[PDB]
Design a protein around this ligand. Structure first.
Ligand SMILES: C[SH](C)CCC(=O)O
Length: 299
């Protein structure tokens, strides 16, 4: 049967839905005993590399983890599936109204030459995200500070998101890291600053704390996966099979997030809502036994 299971909950909205839906399916469907570990990309990958826990890492954004392939080779982790099946795109953004009022902010060089247009500030992703390493590398490669752009490190994904909302309310400038599709970007039309042509080797270097030779590249489009420890896999073929199926298209994730905001729903309430209304999506994720358990508890 299924006993003790630990799973990361990453510190942003889609990630919460992912972990909450997974938890519910594991507990109700397979009688799992699930410990949700609040986490972030960097300490989470660090934690499995060192303690072989937690069992399940998700969402795992692969855009800026250049050493993940190696981790999987050494058999420290195993990729089950892309949990956001459409993927996502990270970048540096300004509000649409700003890009329309002053089109020169649509390229990084344009911004660097006229920092007042963005209020002399860049909003950096928070400590614990792989993106914080990249942004920090890019700030250096473009010499933001030297050009009068202050790199402001947000304390969390929440305060990063709120700084957009605040700026937007008053139609003020904003320049910083974010990603799409997200609720924030659906609610506040943003435009991606052109950071030049993608370069795999430059980005790999930007993604590594120890690579000093930083260069200019935008982020690649992200694959976003659920991963597990081969130990947990060996032990729980049924959960692995289920987690190999558990996945959301961006439309599906959007539809859940919206519902959770139009109500005051907890993450748990959103999960129940998704499962209750989307049998056609998830029925195939679970096995017959689990589906018996779920059929009986869900309504
Ligand atoms: C929230 S994500 C879009 C990226 C996560 C990370 O950079 O560690």
């Amino acid at each position: 049967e299924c006993g003790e299971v630990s799973i990361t909950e990453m510190n942003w909205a889609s990630a919460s839905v992912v972990t909450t839906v997974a938890t519910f399916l594991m507990e109700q469907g397979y009688g799992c005993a699930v410990t949700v570990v609040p986490s972030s990309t960097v300490p989470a990958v660090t934690s499995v590399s060192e303690t072989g826990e937690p069992d399940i890492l998700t969402e795992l954004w692969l855009s800026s983890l250049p050493n993940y392939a190696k981790l999987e080779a050494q058999g420290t982790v195993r990729t089950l599936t892309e949990v956001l099946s459409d993927g996502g795109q990270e970048g540096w953004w300004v509000p649409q109204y700003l890009a329309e009022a002053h089109p020169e902010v649509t390229t990084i060089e344009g911004i660097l030459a006229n920092p007042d247009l963005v209020g002399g500030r860049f909003h950096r992703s928070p400590d614990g995200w792989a993106a914080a390493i990249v942004d920090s590398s890019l700030a250096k490669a473009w010499d933001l500070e030297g050009n009068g752009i202050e790199v402001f490190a947000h304390g969390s994904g929440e305060t990063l998101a709120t700084s957009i909302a605040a700026a937007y309310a008053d139609r003020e400038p904003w320049f910083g890291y974010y990603w799409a599709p997200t609720s924030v970007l659906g609610k506040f039309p943003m435009v991606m600053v052109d950071l030049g042509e993608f370069d795999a080797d430059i980005h790999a270097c930007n993604s590594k704390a120890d690579c000093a030779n930083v260069g200019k590249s935008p982020y690649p489009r992200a694959r976003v996966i659920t991963a597990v420890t081969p130990g947990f896999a060996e032990e729980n073929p049924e959960i692995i099979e289920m987690l190999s199926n558990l996945s959301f298209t961006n439309d599906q994730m959007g539809a859940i997030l919206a519902w959770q905001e139009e109500n005051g729903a907890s993450s748990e309430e959103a999960a129940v809502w998704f499962l209750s209304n989307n049998s056609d999506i998830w029925a195939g994720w679970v096995n017959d036994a689990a589906r018996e358990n779920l059929a009986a508890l869900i309504p």
